Amino acid sequence: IKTTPYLEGDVLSSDSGPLLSVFALQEIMQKVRQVQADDVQKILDDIKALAAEQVYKIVKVPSISFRHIVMQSRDRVLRVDTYYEEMSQVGDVITEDEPEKFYSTIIKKVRFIRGKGSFILHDIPTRDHRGMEVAEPEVLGVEFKNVLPVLTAEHRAMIQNALDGSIIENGNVATRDVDVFIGACSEPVYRIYNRLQGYIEAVQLQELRNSIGWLERLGHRKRITYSQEVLTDFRRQDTIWVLALQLPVNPQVVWDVPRSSIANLIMNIATCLPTGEYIAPNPRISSITLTQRITTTGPFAILTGSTPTAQQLNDVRKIYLALMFPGQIILDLKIDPGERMDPAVRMVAGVVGHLLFTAGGRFTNLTQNMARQLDIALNDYLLYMYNTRVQVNYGPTGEPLDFQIGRNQYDCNVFRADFATGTGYNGWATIDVEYREPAPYVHAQRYIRYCGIDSRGIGMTYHCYNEMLRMLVAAGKDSEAAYFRSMLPFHMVRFARINQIINEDLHSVFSLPDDMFNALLPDLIAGAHQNADPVVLDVSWISLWFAFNRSFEPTHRNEMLEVAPLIESVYASELSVMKVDMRHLSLMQRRFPDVLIQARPSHFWKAVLNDSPEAVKAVMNLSHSHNFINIRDMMRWVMLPSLQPSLKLALEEEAWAAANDFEDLMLTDQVYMHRDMLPEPRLDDIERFRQEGFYYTNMLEAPPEIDRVVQYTYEIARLQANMGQFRAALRRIMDDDDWVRFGGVLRTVRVKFYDARPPDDVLQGLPFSYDTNERGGLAYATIKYATETTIFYLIYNVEFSNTPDSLVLINPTYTMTKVFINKRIVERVRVGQILAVLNRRFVAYKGKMRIMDITQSLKMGT
Amino acid sequence: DHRGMEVAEPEVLGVEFKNVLPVLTAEHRAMIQNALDGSIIENGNVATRD
Prior knowledge:
This is part of a larger assembly, with two copies of chain A. Chain A is built from 29 helices and 35 strands. Chain A is an alpha+beta fold. Chain B: It comes from Bluetongue virus 1 (BTV 1).
């Protein structure tokens, strides 16, 4: 099957060009760009990647959560957990001038803790010892290698046997027996791991059966193309089932998002629209000699023999898109002052648009302007008269079609456009919407039938076509009357194919709800679109004639159709996660009023949308660029009740529950400034320095005293900077030797470990930045209240005593700032209790367990 | 945006006072700034437009 040829510049061609779905996507994006104007394969692949989303990581060995530092001694070593530094390094600079940056950073923090907390064990290694199953040293949550060579032999032996005593303990659960042992893990990720394990130990095989049944229901509805049943091999007891997602999605959740009509249309295009070809009713007629084709003289004879080019091809496929989407796509005429042509093409477009397009009834895909243009064009054609002379009887007004024509006085004024019933178009006294059975999607019960026919036709006509022929036989134009009489079956079969495409392939969650579809036309006639918004595209004149002379026959179905329930369920789960993120952000703001920063619903929405899958971000961005929202929409949408339960949402809720303590999130406000003479090694007598070593930090181990300390809130700091005595005040008060606090707001802090002398910036930086703008301003030099601040852990290398050139600070200097924390990050512990972190219960499934989920396993598709 | 509220910049207001800032004291500038920043922006509807 190949399309009928079209002229390309000077030579005919019959190639299909780009895909129809790609064309629709680029046309809609270009249109919305023009809307705002005062990659299509990338976005399609971004939508495709939504299926490949994976939440829980099946890992061989849990991540190491501790490490050690040893310095010239056997009794004690320093220990540190890596969780705090990994939590801190994902930070970003914070100012209260940017609430959206603030809350986007918080969202990044909680997403990081959720992602690092979600994991599970499958195939742990085992070793044997005297018939006892013992875990390997590497599977633990604590890694130690540097401590072994340096320690005294007795301590080495008494830690070696204790390490060897890590015997695997056996136990049984609902899935028979598994392996249990002790381990070490940090608190938040262990809480997330426990929550995930508790969800896993829940059993919902009945939910699996219901999901299978819904899949089969949708499958026999889509029995024309969807067929995949693999259930025969699933039933083996040596398996583990992870029901991470509930498949019977609820369309109300995804249809509650305000101004989401454009995004829903665009992603329905992405996931359902098929690819076709454009075929003439009589193939290969464009190759025969033109003398055969242009038989005589007339407007129809002039348009006969013309051939289209790429512009008309694109406009014809735009027309077909509008026909396949009645309630979302409307059309108008592309009008410019540069047009010049025969009015014959305008007359034929006028006479044919009444047959091709529908108005009134239950749905209309034309504008009032377009309907009026079609009416005046048909008036011009009916008044146009070249080979005969017949009588005409005009009416009282100057309206189009307000006359009577023919030997019998026949009223053509019915064909004047009216949206109340649709007399002049295909909605004229013919049923088009009907209900048969409860659909698998509970909001898309309707069936759309053009011209009242169903594919489940030879020689059938319909009402509008019958009175069209009645018009034309009253007008006495028997030439094109016979032409339309002969061309009837092609029109009927093409509209049957369009009906089949509309009713069968397009059934998805993204179809417009029935109430909104019925209320679209009242909103259109009223003029105020309070609920939904369609889009209107421009199309040329002769594209109508070429559309009536062409057809649409599919060749390749949409490849994404095999995972569309999966991607839509994931998409709804993402919406639910974002909504609960909004809720918990609002609650956290209420919970901590004195130190958090006030933001608006728009700020919260942008913050929660900043970290999101790319397809979701792009579709929301384009929808909200096309159509607007206000604070009222956010305040309503945050209060709506519906949610989509999921493992992802449960993990998010548990992440918030662990993040109730905002201080544990590597955020604080306990930053202080106080001059300390920076300690340095004496480096005079070599042997004692080698035996001792030295390490230092700016840690505040205890909170400072309530007296001899001042506070600077941001407003006082701003006013002092605007005055210009900020440096003087700080200088005098620090010459007074007092503590100072930069409290009021949350500051991100980084942590970093140093084995040598660092650059001077981290040594003696300041919590603020001071910039002296040009003289003659309103407010003089200004202050950025918060900037990069880094707590540092300085531990020198004893070997570098041979080369002090990289270790001497040349000239003595002061240390400027200090930070207070309450949690333990690095602590000095005696070697007698290194193993004191082995306090968490690790469980693991056997290797022979086959652990998976069929909803993600189905994506093979063969 | 100040304290979560939209406040217009001080130059949209048709008052020129850049010359008298260096003569005021601490308290005077404090009350002048406190009065100035409180001119929030309210929302309204005109001809069914926001």
